[PDB]
Amino acid sequence: VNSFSGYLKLTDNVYIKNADIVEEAKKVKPTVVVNAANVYLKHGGGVAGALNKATNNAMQVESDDYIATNGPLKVGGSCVLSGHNLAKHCLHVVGPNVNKGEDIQLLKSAYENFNQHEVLLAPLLSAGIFGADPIHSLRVCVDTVRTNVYLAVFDKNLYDKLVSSFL
């Protein structure tokens, strides 16, 4: 039993809500919040820019020190850093940027990182500036993640359509 509220159950382990992941994190303070990162951990916009702003830029400061020590992430890869005032931990995951020509197959690799954590609050990966169809990203998530994932979908029209979809 956890403190997530109002989620629609999609499968045994996948749940979804029309919500801003930042507000969900502030209210729930989950163990893990997923950031939709780029390989440089430059948190400019979308999920990453909004999460970082909610940490008063502490996420960016920590991330710059991580890059200085370790270099960039791989597309499809991840790292665990602090969750600051939003969560215990933040799992920074890099989905492929289809607008950069990056291979959509890397979206499955990106979601595989979620399986290292028992419970996560997460966005749909590779949407926004990365240009992947969120309908597709949900299918990959359901078919890849085996741990318990709570998906916060910002866009109402998109959420309304995602939950009214499939087979």
Ligand X SMILES: OC[C@@H]1CC2(CCCCC2)CN1c1ncnc2[nH]ccc12
Residues near ligand X (CB under 6 A) are: 20-22, 36, 46-47, 50, 123-124, 127-128, 152, 154-155
Residue type, 10: L
The residue (of 30 and 128) whose beta carbon lies closer to ligand X is 128
Q: Which CB atom, from 53 or from 82, has the smaller least distance to ligand X?
A: 53
For 94, half-sphere exposure in the C-beta direction (CA atoms, 13 angstrom radius) is 18
Closest distance to ligand X from the beta carbon of 48 (Å): 9
Nearer to ligand X, 70 or 99 (CB): 99
Q: How far is the CB of 40 from ligand X (least distance, A)?
A: 18
Separation CA 58–CA 63 (nearest Å): 8
Number of C-beta neighbours around residue 97 at 10 A: 18
Q: Cβ neighbours of residue 133 under 8 Å, at least 6 residues apart?
A: 127
CB of 49 to ligand X, least distance (A): 8
